[PDB]
Amino acid sequence: SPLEEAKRLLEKVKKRVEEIMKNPNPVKVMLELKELLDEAVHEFVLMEVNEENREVLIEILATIFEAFLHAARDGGNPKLVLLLLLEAFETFVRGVEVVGVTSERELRLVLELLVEFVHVFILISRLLEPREFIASMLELLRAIERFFEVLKGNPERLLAVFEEVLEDIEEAVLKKLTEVNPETQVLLLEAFYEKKKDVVEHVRKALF
Amino acid sequence: SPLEEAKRLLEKVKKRVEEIMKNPNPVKVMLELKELLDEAVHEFVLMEVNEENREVLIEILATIFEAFLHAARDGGNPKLVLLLLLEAFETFVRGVEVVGVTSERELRLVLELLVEFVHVFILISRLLEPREFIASMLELLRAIERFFEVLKGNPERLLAVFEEVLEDIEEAVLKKLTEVNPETQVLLLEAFYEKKKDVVEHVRKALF
Amino acid sequence: SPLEEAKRLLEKVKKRVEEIMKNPNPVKVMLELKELLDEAVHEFVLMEVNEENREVLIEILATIFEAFLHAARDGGNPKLVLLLLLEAFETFVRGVEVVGVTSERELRLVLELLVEFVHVFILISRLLEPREFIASMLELLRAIERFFEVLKGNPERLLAVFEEVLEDIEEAVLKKLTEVNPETQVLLLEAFYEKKKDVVEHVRKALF
Amino acid sequence: SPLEEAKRLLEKVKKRVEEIMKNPNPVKVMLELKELLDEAVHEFVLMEVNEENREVLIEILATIFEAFLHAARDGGNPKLVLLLLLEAFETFVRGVEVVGVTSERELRLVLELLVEFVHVFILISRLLEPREFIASMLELLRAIERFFEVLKGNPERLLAVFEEVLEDIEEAVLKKLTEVNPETQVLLLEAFYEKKKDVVEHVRKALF
Amino acid sequence: SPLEEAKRLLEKVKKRVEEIMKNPNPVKVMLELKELLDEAVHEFVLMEVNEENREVLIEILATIFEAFLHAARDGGNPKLVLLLLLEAFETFVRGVEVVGVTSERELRLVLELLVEFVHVFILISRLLEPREFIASMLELLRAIERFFEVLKGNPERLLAVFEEVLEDIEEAVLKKLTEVNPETQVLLLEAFYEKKKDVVEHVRKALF
Amino acid sequence: SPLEEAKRLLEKVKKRVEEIMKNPNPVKVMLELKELLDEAVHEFVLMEVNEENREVLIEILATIFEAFLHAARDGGNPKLVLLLLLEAFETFVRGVEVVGVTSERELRLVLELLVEFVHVFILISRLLEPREFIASMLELLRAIERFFEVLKGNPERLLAVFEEVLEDIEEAVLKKLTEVNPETQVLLLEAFYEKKKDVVEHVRKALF
Amino acid sequence: SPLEEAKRLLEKVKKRVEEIMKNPNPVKVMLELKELLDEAVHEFVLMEVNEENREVLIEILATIFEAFLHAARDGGNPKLVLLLLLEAFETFVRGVEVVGVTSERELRLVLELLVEFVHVFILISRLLEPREFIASMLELLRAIERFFEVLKGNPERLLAVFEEVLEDIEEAVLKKLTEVNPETQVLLLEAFYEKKKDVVEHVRKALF
Ligand SMILES: [Zn+2]
Ligand SMILES: [Zn+2]
Ligand SMILES: [Zn+2]
Ligand SMILES: [Zn+2]
Ligand SMILES: [Zn+2]
Ligand SMILES: [Zn+2]
Ligand SMILES: [Zn+2]
Ligand SMILES: [Zn+2]
Ligand SMILES: [Zn+2]
Ligand SMILES: [Zn+2]
Ligand SMILES: [Zn+2]
Ligand SMILES: [Zn+2]
Ligand SMILES: [Zn+2]
Ligand SMILES: [Zn+2]
């Protein structure tokens, strides 16, 4: 039965996550969580996904990704942490694509996860230099564009969420760019705004 | 149900505000309240906003903003406090734009919040030097212009409130500018009056 | 046909400007307007400019530059705004050089734009400190000298306009320099007057 | 034994204070006294505080703080002295919070120390300019509010002491504000009275 | 016999520390002390640790760590010294975990060592730039969290010590962050307070 | 023939200078003029310098250096312009050393060039901050010392010129240093006067 | 014979110093003098140092170090010059340790050299920023501590010289630290005074 096997997988994943978080090393915890997410996706593609077990699969993905976001908040080297965050987000997007999102609860869960991911990413990247900060923000913009192209649902709510996270990123960039000379400010602002306009056009094309 | 979830959110926000206000550090309190306001806006864009729960959402926003205004009155470094006040006001305006204001009670709530915000801003900026004071007043004028462009309602009452807060700012500026030489007075008065004329034109275009 | 393509470009530019000015962020509006001005110059150098379509090209340049000047008056960080104003003015001067000014109406349009630019520059730079203010005035003097070297027309009217804008700058500098000690006044006045004498010599050589 | 260790600590602290006060540099003396106060608090949180050794710990704190207040009266740069006084007062309040006040002798000791601190602060800040004077008075009001929120005891005596020190500060502010124009007087008086009303409300809430 | 071997190890370690401290090069002294600490831990895991020799092992660890802290105060390159301090602290925490802390004297010894370590770390990091200073403070927060997770004892005294060292770090950060613009202050304060809240939650979970 | 080749070089250099000066970019003009001066020195060391063509070579150097000084007065970034000015002066000194100065006309020419260089340097560096201003003045003192060590001629006239340019620098420094606190004034004045005494002693040793 | 070889070495070193000092480049002169000092130390360790040739070796060291101090006063990049000054001082201390100081004349010579070194170091470091200035002062304190640990002689005169140079450094630091905010002043003063107390303790241990 699909539902029973999905529930067994959920219990196994919960036990594995609880075991993993006990480690004191944050980078090791992130690596094990990334491996667990990949195994969950591999299990997803090897099983039938009907309308009964979809909620359980979404809950498994949410559990692993929430643990990963907390472990990222725990700390480490910012560049490595940001790279691992991007890899985990790509795996999560692939998993959501495989499973699919139908009901409103799953949409709410994945959107809350996206908001938390953006917040954690900005919090980690606060401590870089302005040029590396702008490069990281460009990478985050690409990731958000990919996520919103994959996801399907009500266009209006998705557009509202997209605009809100974009405002968050814009506020962070504007606050950070006050540490440099006006010429560097103009250069970096032009780069950021060109990328933002492009991703807005792409997302508006995909949603509507 | 929208109404039940909105009431649950209101109770949670009230509990969080009571917990936060107990801290003795005003800057930490302000930062936590700013984070809470952002989280409230995130929750707002993730749920349906019909005519039943709109009052509850406006009440949540008013609660958080009142707590923030009191914490700003508590004290700290004036420049940091003023910048945090501007950021909180921008988040509040975004939340009001998302929720929308329909009835008279919500309009009354947001207008009293604006009046209190202007009073607190002037009170905090009283202690700067004249040039930084005029720069802060220019920032406040831009914020008020943004607020009155976003808001919708009866044009006459909105115009009356706008004129009253403008008179408040003008009186504060006139009283402060008596500490400098007449040439500096002429320069700063010219800057302030040019900005005031521009914002009056913009607001009158937007309202009517 | 050159005239039809010029009119189509005028309509497209008007539509783009109207779309851009709806944004609430003044710095983003300025960046988009600068990009549009550069695109207009690119279009100008790629097409034939005879005596028929010259007026339309001058009107396109005037439209974009008027929108930029208003957006600059809207507000922002003074140093960044002044830097963007200088970049826009250089792009405008290059466009005028490419197109050329023959009739009296085009000369009137460009001279009015120059007067508005000087007024906006002084208004924005009012809020700096005296040393940065004097540096900004030096930059403005170099920009005005370049503009009057590029332009061709009746020497007497051009000299009258140049003298009037110089008097405006001198009045602003004299009013601002009353906030410092007499020794700093002597230093900054010496720097300003040396630069003014040099630019007067250069402009008088170029015009006659 | 707690009592014997507390008495040994008192003897060591007395010897250290006598050794430190022999230095001719007042700022260095203040820095060493701050370090000694921090070390005393560290010792306090690392040992048991019963009803036997509480008096000895209170006398240790009083000894260090009295030495600091005399050194602050000795002289130096007023802004640096005021900042060091505020830091020392906050450390003293933390130490009192850790130890606690039960008997009447300890209450009398700490209240006398607060009165001397307010007197020294007003004496040092007499020589600033009126705007910086009002800023320092606001900082002093916040410090007094924190002290009276931390302390526990008889509400009536505490309220009497609070009202008396408030009257002292008000008299100092009124006497100082006669050196400026009436408009500056109105602005600074409004700021001071708003802050005083807020702190009175907070203290009356905390005491009763 | 365990006790005799422990005392022989103590004498050998004392002789080695005295021999090492005679070197004039601070970085070389720190490296030799780190090697000696690692050797002591290796010896600890190779012998039986009962309730008789535990005090001697704790005294050996305290001796080596006190020598290391003094050598770190001696001087050198701030980044290298801070990195070596973190490595030595991790080795010390592992040694304390291996040996264990049972009586009150050992707890007092290790807590005094922690206070000294925090003071030395702040003193060394005073000379960095604000961004590197905040990064160092985050690393220190992680180190303190790991220490208080490893240690076992009376929850109340441990919590008091933890709160006091947190207040020390907070005062240092607040004093340092006055050298930057308010936007940078907001960014860095948000990062610091997020990390502080996370470590407070983790420590409160571990202790209770 | 040496004289004919020198005259041909003079004509070529005049043509090149006229061609270069037409550029509107001052920094590019300065870079080309520096390259031209270097090429002139290369040509000087590659040809015979008798008493016939010495005047022509001195005139070539004076032509290029006058063009460079005017281009420096035109404007740009003060730090870049000052550094380019120092390099150009060092190249000019090397050229004068290679060619040599024998008659009175050449001495008058080079001394007038030195006076103009000092005036332009002070004019450009008027707009820096006091610490960078004093650093630039120290660099100028080293350059003047090197120039007066290389040059040969009548000791009395050279000493008079050296004293006059020193008085100009001293007046500029004294007038600038009124914008800082008396402690900073004492520090910067001590540095400047130590350097001035050293260069005076060196120049008096070299001349006599 | 030791004395004849020492005198021959003195003559050779005098000739080499006279040849080197003729160079116009200060950094090249300083590097050459550093190499010469190293070669002198190499020669010192390769020959017998009895009581007859000790004076000549001390005179050789004094000659090279005086030339180096003058070259450092000549000028250059402050950071590079300070680093070269520290390296030269360390080589000089090694040479003094190898040769040894017995009579009163040698002690007077080396102490005069130390006073001149401290004066030159403070003069060069006057022009840095306050944070880099304090870092340089910390490095100078370590250098002085090493010097006074190596030297042997009458404890009272050595202590008097040490106290006097410490007062010179303290006066310089106090004068410089008036250019920053009181919080930065407190941080930097705490760092400086901690280091000064540590070096005073070390020197008092070494001398007595
Ligand atoms: Zn965590
Ligand atoms: Zn957000
Ligand atoms: Zn309050
Ligand atoms: Zn009002
Ligand atoms: Zn406008
Ligand atoms: Zn005008
Ligand atoms: Zn006294
Ligand atoms: Zn009183
Ligand atoms: Zn030490
Ligand atoms: Zn402490
Ligand atoms: Zn020129
Ligand atoms: Zn002159
Ligand atoms: Zn010299
Ligand atoms: Zn001295």
**Rounded CA Rg of chain A:** 18
- Alpha carbon E135 to its chain's center: 17
CA angle A118, A119, A125 (to 5 degrees): 85
d(CA C139, CA C127): 16
Q: If interface means Cβ-Cβ distance under 8 Å, which residues of chain E face chain G?
A: 24, 73-75, 123, 126-127, 175-176, 178-179
Which residue of chain B comes nearest to A164, CA vs CA? Answer: B42
- Looking at the partner chain, which of A24, A75, A175 has a beta carbon nearest the beta carbon of E186? A175
Neighbours of A129 (CB within 10 A): 12
E123: Cβ–Cβ under 8 A, 6 or more apart, which residues? Answer: E73, G190, G191, G194
> Which of B100, B109, B104 has the alpha carbon at shortest distance from B152?
B100
- Looking at the partner chain, which of E108, E167, E168 has a beta carbon nearest the beta carbon of D46? E108
User: F119 alpha carbon to ligand 12 midpoint, in Å?
Assistant: 6
Residue with tokens 């130890």: D99
**Rounded CA Rg of chain B:** 18
- Alpha carbon B21 to its chain's center: 19
Touching subunits of G (3+ CB pairs, under 8 Å) are D, E, F
Q: If interface means Cβ-Cβ distance under 8 Å, which residues of chain F face chain C?
A: 24, 73-75, 123, 126-127, 175-176, 178-179
Are C187 and F74 in contact (CB < 8 Å)?
no
* B28 neighbourhood in chain E, CB within 8 Å: 193
* C126 neighbourhood in chain B, CB within 8 Å: 187-188, 190-191
- Alpha carbon G17 to its chain's center: 18
d(CA C168, CA C172): 6
Residue D25, sorted as left (phi over 0), alpha (psi -120 to 50) or beta, turns out to be beta
> Which of C88, C169, C71, C185 has the alpha carbon at shortest distance from C126?
C169
User: E31 alpha carbon to ligand 9 midpoint, in Å?
Assistant: 16
Among the bound ligands, the one closest to the CA of E66: 9
Say how many residues make up chain D. 208
> Which of E165, E135, E150 has the alpha carbon at shortest distance from E101?
E150
User: D199 alpha carbon to ligand 3 midpoint, in Å?
Assistant: 7
> Which of E100, E98, E28, E39 has the alpha carbon at shortest distance from E64?
E39
DSSP string, chain A: -HHHHHHHHHHHHHHHHHHHHT-S-HHHHHHHHHHHHHHHHHHHHTS---TTTHHHHHHHHHHHHHHHHHHHHH---HHHHHHHHHHHHHHHHHHHHHH---SHHHHHHHHHHHHHHHHHHHHHHTTS-HHHHHHHHHHHHHHHHHHHHH--S-HHHHHHHHHHHHHHHHHHHHHHGGGS-HHHHHHHHHHHHHHHHHHHHHHHHHH-
Which of D183, D197, D202, D205 to mutate against chain B (most B CBs within 10 Å)?
D183
Joined tokens for residue D138: 């606001």
Phi/psi at G181 (5° precision) = -70, 155
- Looking at the partner chain, which of F74, F127, F175 has a beta carbon nearest the beta carbon of C186? F175
CA dihedral G189, G191, G194, G200 (to 10 degrees): -80
Residues F150-186 as b/e (b if ≥16 CB within 10 A, e otherwise) read ebebeeeebeebbeebbeebeebbebbbebbeeebee
Q: Kindly state the DSSP code that residue G179 receives in the 8-state scheme.
A: G
- Looking at the partner chain, which of D27, D31, D83 has a beta carbon nearest the beta carbon of G183? D83
Residues E159-182 as b/e (b if ≥16 CB within 10 A, e otherwise) read bbbbebbbebbbebbbbbbbbbeb
- Alpha carbon E191 to its chain's center: 23
Are G146 and E178 in contact (CB < 8 Å)?
no
* E115 neighbourhood in chain D, CB within 8 Å: 42
- Alpha carbon G82 to its chain's center: 11
Asked if residue F68 lies in contact with residue F30, where contact means CB atoms within 8 angstroms, the answer is yes
Asked if residue C207 lies in contact with residue F199, where contact means CB atoms within 8 angstroms, the answer is no
d(CA E139, CA E145): 10
- Alpha carbon E174 to its chain's center: 22
Asked if residue A41 lies in contact with residue A94, where contact means CB atoms within 8 angstroms, the answer is yes
- Looking at the partner chain, which of G24, G74, G127 has a beta carbon nearest the beta carbon of F191? G127
Q: Kindly state the DSSP code that residue B179 receives in the 8-state scheme.
A: G
Which residue of chain D comes nearest to E156, CA vs CA? Answer: D45
CA angle E50, E54, E55 (to 5 degrees): 150
Phi/psi at B162 (5° precision) = -60, -45
Joined tokens for residue G167: 């007062």
Residue with tokens 């490893």: E150
User: Rounded to whole angstroms, what are the CA distances from G32 to A30, G28, G42?
Assistant: 55, 6, 15
B141: Cβ–Cβ under 8 A, 6 or more apart, which residues? Answer: B169, B195, B196, B199
Burial of residue B201 (CB within 10 Å: 0-12, 13-18, 19+) is exposed
Residues D115-124 as b/e (b if ≥16 CB within 10 A, e otherwise) read eebbebbbeb
- Note whether G touches B: 3 CB pairs or more under 8 A: no
Neighbours of E146 (CB within 10 A): 17
> Which of D130, D204, D128 has the alpha carbon at shortest distance from D166?
D204
3-class DSSP string for chain F: CHHHHHHHHHHHHHHHHHHHHCCCCHHHHHHHHHHHHHHHHHHHHCCCCCCCCHHHHHHHHHHHHHHHHHHHHHCCCHHHHHHHHHHHHHHHHHHHHHHCCCCHHHHHHHHHHHHHHHHHHHHHHCCCCHHHHHHHHHHHHHHHHHHHHHCCCCHHHHHHHHHHHHHHHHHHHHHHHHHCCHHHHHHHHHHHHHHHHHHHHHHHHHHC
> Which of A68, A61, A67 has the alpha carbon at shortest distance from A94?
A61
> Which of A201, A70, A68, A90 has the alpha carbon at shortest distance from A139?
A90
DSSP string, E52-109: TTHHHHHHHHHHHHHHHHHHHHH---HHHHHHHHHHHHHHHHHHHHHH---SHHHHHH
* C79 neighbourhood in chain A, CB within 8 Å: 182
Asked if residue B151 lies in contact with residue B165, where contact means CB atoms within 8 angstroms, the answer is no
**This structure's resolution (angstroms)?**
2.6
Residue with tokens 């802290």: E69
Are E75 and G138 in contact (CB < 8 Å)?
yes
Joined tokens for residue A157: 């709510």
Enumerate the H helices of chain B as residue ranges: 2-21, 26-45, 54-74, 78-99, 104-125, 130-150, 155-176, 182-207
Residue with tokens 């540096």: C135
Are G123 and F190 in contact (CB < 8 Å)?
yes
Are G190 and E73 in contact (CB < 8 Å)?
no
Touching subunits of B (3+ CB pairs, under 8 Å) are A, C, D, E
DSSP string, E35-54: HHHHHHHHHHHTS---TTTH
* B32 neighbourhood in chain E, CB within 8 Å: 193
